[PDB]
Design a protein around this ligand. Structure first.
Ligand SMILES: Nc1ncnc2c1ncn2[C@@H]1O[C@H](COP(=O)(O)O)[C@@H](O)[C@H]1O
Ligand SMILES: Nc1ncnc2c1ncn2[C@@H]1O[C@H](COP(=O)(O)O)[C@@H](O)[C@H]1O
Ligand SMILES: [Cl-]
Ligand SMILES: [Cl-]
Ligand SMILES: [Cl-]
Ligand SMILES: [Cl-]
Lengths: 481, 381
């Protein structure tokens, strides 16, 4: 039911291992526990009470790391806010979460939220003095540690309640998938308010592993940093990976693991990764699962094109259609289970009752398993297009459209015909003929899947997580033929 | 509260990794799961049902490993009997544990136990046909997996109830401690009925790590195995460590896990000849080690057990209050790898547990830097 605070214990065990390398600075676990302890004392001074909820609105900085751990030490549910949310979107999550506080800095417009929560400035806060406190030495495994909002393109975002046990099991289960050395160091250049970034902070204290932290992704800063600090592990999305490949001949020899999240990698991209010696682990997972729950090892990259792999140890997946488990290759909804799967959505009775079934979580993702149990992810249930009687998965068409030389971004929505039909929306680099494109699709897609008409834009309607909002491409800009 | 069966999931994930190296043979996890499922189907034919208690009396053999897993797959508590005990020490434990079965072989006299339990001969048992069964695909974390008796110099042995949870957390904590590698291989030449040998079996299937198994310890056979199979981890008692060092330390070996008492002569020859020896403190109650001392500290934290594994806790108490460094007191352990309760010992359970902590019955102190020094059991003084 409880473990010692990971940071306190990590500090007690290996006080002088590096916890955080951030720009110039290095921070030891002892230092990090010290920083975090005093920040907790300062928050304690501003009336932040055990059992409260503080929201965090910060770019990737050492202070954000301290704030997360400080909340832990005070016993305060931490809400991680996407910094690219609109003012309105932030306000909703502040209200919905029941935050009493917003810990932000001068880089945001604090006063915009003062009317609903007690705003606090990470840097103005740190200067202060306060009565020292006796910290929570124990984490309760079933307590909500962090709340994180989903960013699906359907509906109002849901707060995922992630327990200390969730995070612990995520970290452990991942180490059994990837192994762990004392020489391991992990580069995080993704936001810490997304679970790919946040979970690394917990991997760190639990493994006693250094996290090298970048505020943003810039390929040269990362490559330098990789070499300056002997980085063995990096987390990436497809675009960060594409950039690493074009900026290198071979893969930096320090790197032993590239954890690719977000979506599949197109066949040419992986094939070069194998050629240039890039050890790419593809993965599937979500906010609901506290980072990855399924992974594919490099040695299966080409052999299992399009697969997210197999579940981590202690975890399970299955595929279901109307209450019944699906045969191999039969499309259905992906369901997940394991000690890393979230408690429940916060304050969402309807979604909870609908998304759970006997300890399994319904992910909202469509997919299937092949005979060996590898998982293939189709994309969201909600974006399904039944054109004929048959199903159309937008991610499939977008993929074929995107692989074209002249296509920059592709989006597929289901319009109407006296028979729903598929429409494409292409951002372009070069110009491209609708005949030149229809025949690219002809070669690569069943006829009924191919986009009826084509539209063109300069940008496609994305939410604050860069996710394509399909319901809304009707419309923005002008499309020809 | 539940995990899929470690062996089943491990066989699903990496079917052809080597589970077991024993003598000639090697057994893949797919094979280990097939063998353990078969044996479990054969036990079921002999009326061994879910919720029963089976004792196991065997030397280190591949067949013992199957038996352990067959119990898990059946939902059957496994009692591991020390083969070097007297028959009556064994009969006491069979009665105490409520075993309905004893799995053993020709090496032992079955007729010596059958007036109390049904006896089953592992090798005859295997030769038999059996209908297929629906195995137990989940381990409940809070259920007893194995019952293992205390080697009590302090009176009547107690059955340590070791949960699936305890074993898992023990294996996970140790990994956080030592690190784990695909290339890692662990040699066991110690008895499987002691927790030090048993726990490798669980490490094996949770990590997906090969265990190199050895019926007994003979320096020549062990060093030949170490090299032929590139062992990286090995579990050893004080005696075995003297014997191996006297015959020279293989580059292949990365960790030597030492168990039992704390010898200033001994350790430096290890450092010199190049032995990465990890000193440790554990008990049956903690389902393996709960404290370890890295080689980086042998000199000079002399006489120290080391520091608690992650998730695990160590304090030192006298009267009913916390001692200070370095003031002596009774060592008390705590953590998810620590046994819940002794089997059918109401008095000893309240005696031994003060608020989530286990009174260890050993005395010791912590230094300024919080390392553990273990002195002697409080009993004799
Ligand atoms: N490997 C993958 N392949 C396809 N879709 C993915 C993959 N990983 C994540 N996703 C999508 O991203 C969602 C998780 O979103 P988030 O909570 O924002 O990380 C999942 O439900 C999937 O729909
Ligand atoms: N390094 C050590 N120093 C002192 N006593 C030990 C050490 N290792 C094990 N023991 C004793 O062995 C007991 C458990 O032995 P066993 O239950 O047979 O594993 C512990 O309670 C300790 O008292
Ligand atoms: Cl380590
Ligand atoms: Cl639930
Ligand atoms: Cl025999
Ligand atoms: Cl071999």
């Amino acid at each position: 039911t409880e473990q010692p605070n990971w940071l306190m214990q990590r500090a007690q065990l290996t006080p002088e291992r590096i916890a955080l390398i951030y720009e110039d600075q290095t921070v030891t676990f002892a230092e990090l526990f010290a920083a975090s302890k005093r920040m907790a004392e300062q928050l304690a001074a501003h009336s932040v009470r055990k059992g409260d909820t503080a929201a965090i609105l910060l770019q990737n900085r050492a202070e954000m790391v301290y704030a997360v751990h400080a909340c832990f030490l005070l016993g305060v549910k931490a809400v991680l806010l996407n910094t690219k949310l609109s003012t309105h979107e932030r306000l909703f999550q502040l209200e919905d979460s029941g935050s009493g506080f917003l810990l932000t800095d001068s880089s945001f417009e604090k006063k915009e939220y003062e009317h609903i929560v007690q705003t606090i400035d990470v840097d103005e806060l740190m200067k202060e003095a306060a009565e020292e406190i006796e910290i929570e030495a124990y984490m309760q495994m079933d307590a909500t540690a962090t709340l994180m909002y989903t960013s699906g393109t359907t509906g109002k975002p849901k707060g995922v309640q992630q327990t200390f046990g969730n995070h612990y099991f995520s970290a452990v289960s991942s180490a059994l998938n990837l192994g762990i050395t004392e020489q391991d160091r992990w580069l995080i250049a993704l936001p810490l308010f997304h679970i790919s970034g946040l979970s690394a902070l917990f991997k760190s204290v639990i493994y006693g592993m250094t996290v090298v932290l970048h505020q943003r992704f810039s390929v040269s800063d990362v490559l330098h940093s990789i070499n300056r600090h002997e980085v063995t592990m990096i987390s990436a999305v497809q675009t960060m990976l594409a950039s690493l490949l074009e900026e290198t001949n071979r893969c930096p020899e320090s790197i032993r693991c590239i954890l690719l999240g977000g979506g599949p990698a197109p066949l040419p991209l992986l094939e070069e990764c194998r050629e240039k010696g890039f050890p790419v682990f593809q993965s599937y997972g979500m906010t609901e699962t506290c980072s990855q729950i399924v992974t594919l090892s490099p040695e299966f990259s080409m052999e299992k094109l399009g697969s997210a792999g197999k579940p981590l140890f202690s975890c399970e997946i299955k595929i279901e259609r109307d209450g019944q488990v699906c045969e191999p290759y039969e499309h259905g909804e992906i369901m997940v289970k394991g000690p890393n799967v979230m408690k429940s959505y916060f304050n969402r009775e309807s979604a909870n009752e609908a998304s759970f079934q006997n300890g399994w979580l319904k992910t909202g993702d469509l997919g299937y398993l092949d005979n060996e149990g590898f998982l293939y992810v189709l994309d969201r249930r909600s974006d399904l297009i039944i054109s004929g009687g048959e199903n159309i998965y937008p991610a499939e068409v977008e993929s074929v459209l995107l692989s074209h030389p002249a296509v920059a971004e592709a989006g597929v929505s289901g319009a109407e015909d006296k028979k729903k039909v598929p429409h494409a929306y292409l951002v372009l680099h070069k110009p491209v003929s609708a005949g030149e494109l229809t025949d690219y699709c002809k070669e690569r897609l069943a006829k009924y899947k191919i986009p009826a008409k084509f539209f063109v834009l300069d940008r496609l309607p994305r939410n604050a997580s860069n996710k394509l909002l399909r319901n809304q491409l009707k419309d923005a800009r002008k499309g020809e033929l």
